[PDB]
Design a protein around this ligand. Structure first.
Ligand SMILES: [Zn+2]
Length: 58
């Protein structure tokens, strides 16, 4: 059964890989969540983005 990401899921995955202000530990936790159930991508992405923005350099 083919488990290739649809565009919504792929976009989330790549955005999390590339968000600049996550630590490795933070990033890997979010990616692991998606690897386990990709249907939660939109919620996980929203969390990752908030954390990324909170940790932006000033
Ligand atoms: Zn400054």
């Amino acid at each position: 059964a083919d488990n290739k990401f649809n565009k919504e899921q792929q976009n989330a995955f790549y955005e999390i890989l590339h968000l600049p202000n996550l630590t490795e530990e933070q990033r890997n936790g979010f990616i692991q969540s998606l690897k386990d159930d990709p249907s939660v991508s939109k919620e996980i992405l929203a969390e990752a983005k908030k954390l990324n923005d909170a940790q932006a350099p000033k």
